[PDB]
Design a protein around this ligand. Sequence first.
Ligand SMILES: O=C(NO)c1ccc(Cn2c3c(c4cc(Br)ccc42)S[C@@H](c2ccccc2)C3)s1
Ligand SMILES: [K+]
Ligand SMILES: [K+]
Ligand SMILES: [Zn+2]
Length: 402
Amino acid sequence: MSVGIVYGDQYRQLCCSSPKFGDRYALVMDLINAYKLIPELSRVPPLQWDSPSRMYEAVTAFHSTEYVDALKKLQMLHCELTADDELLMDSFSLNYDCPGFPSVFDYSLAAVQGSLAAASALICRHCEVVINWGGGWHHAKRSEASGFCYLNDIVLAIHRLTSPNRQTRVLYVDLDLHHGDGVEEAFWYSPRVVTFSVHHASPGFFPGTGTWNMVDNDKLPIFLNGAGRGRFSAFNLPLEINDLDWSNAIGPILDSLNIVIQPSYVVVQCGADCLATDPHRIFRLTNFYPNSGYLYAIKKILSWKVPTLILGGGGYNFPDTARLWTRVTALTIEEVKGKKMTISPEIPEHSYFSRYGPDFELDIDYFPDSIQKHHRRILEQLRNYADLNKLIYDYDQVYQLY
Ligand SMILES: O=C(NO)c1ccc(Cn2c3c(c4cc(Br)ccc42)S[C@@H](c2ccccc2)C3)s1
Ligand SMILES: [K+]
Ligand SMILES: [K+]
Ligand SMILES: [Zn+2]
């Protein structure tokens, strides 16, 4: 019922203004349009503020005044650096892996604009599900920029998320290869927003969080999962993996969270760093139809009949990221609108066609205990969280999932 997608001319220009990603958003958008999926999707234009003060209020709802001012100064100055300017940019980590360029603030803000527009569309009940491939930056902190993430659109969108109903709870699920540290930290003390991440964790791997907590004692390391009343609310799955193993690792956890928490809204990060074709070469996820962990997770999330917001994020293989996200968009249309879509395995000729070689197939050119202990730990954590928040559940079906 009226799936949503976020795109616009200025949105296209500014989302494709990052030297790291280049024209990834342009390729993704052109691949959705080339398969004639745009007429099956409702346009959600990015949200604009009537005054710069309103934008400041919206952004600083999570971030700090000094950080936003420093990012604006970086954008202004890049359009040499003084010693004090270098010092201030280093203090906020506005360099190194987050380099400056003339459109840092504009692009980082456009991502938040799209995410907040999707949030408003979900709240107003205009769209059952809204999609935004220009956002999904889960590494941005209050007073820090990490992993080319300057503004955390996810945190602000979740915060923005009335009928009589009752207390509102939002379930965040992160499928990026890297840990959702920013969203977890933002809602570390909040039980209403339940943050879950599935990621790779190895020593020296960015960021190194979402795994066993290293402390100074002889006891075995444990998993930190919140504080105060937001304790036991942060869930993380660190994995050392193919589509089937990833699907079996994710399924029971997300089903248990949906059953227990009973959230009003769901927000999914679909960063494409887990693809086997990704240059990082960590996980072995694909985009294949016959039954891909991405598609399985998305379908199982959509099966809950809960309003959902899908975001992009990580991914360096722009054509294959576009293939994955186009398949995800088509499957969302099929699941929500109830209208099947027959995606042509041969990629239609379009603008960026030349970059989808050399086989020009929709499927990507790739030819293909820890988990049970993790399952038990997350099951106990979910039990503790449910008892802490006094949630009603049978404690029998959830065990049967595992
Ligand atoms: O957006 C992301 N996930 O969603 C990211 C994951 C990793 C990131 C951070 N990073 C890294 C490189 C790099 C080159 C530019 Br230009 C800008 C940022 C960069 S090479 C590597 C590296 C960094 C530091 C030292 C050695 C190698 C990791 S961005
Ligand atoms: K993740
Ligand atoms: K939390
Ligand atoms: Zn990533």
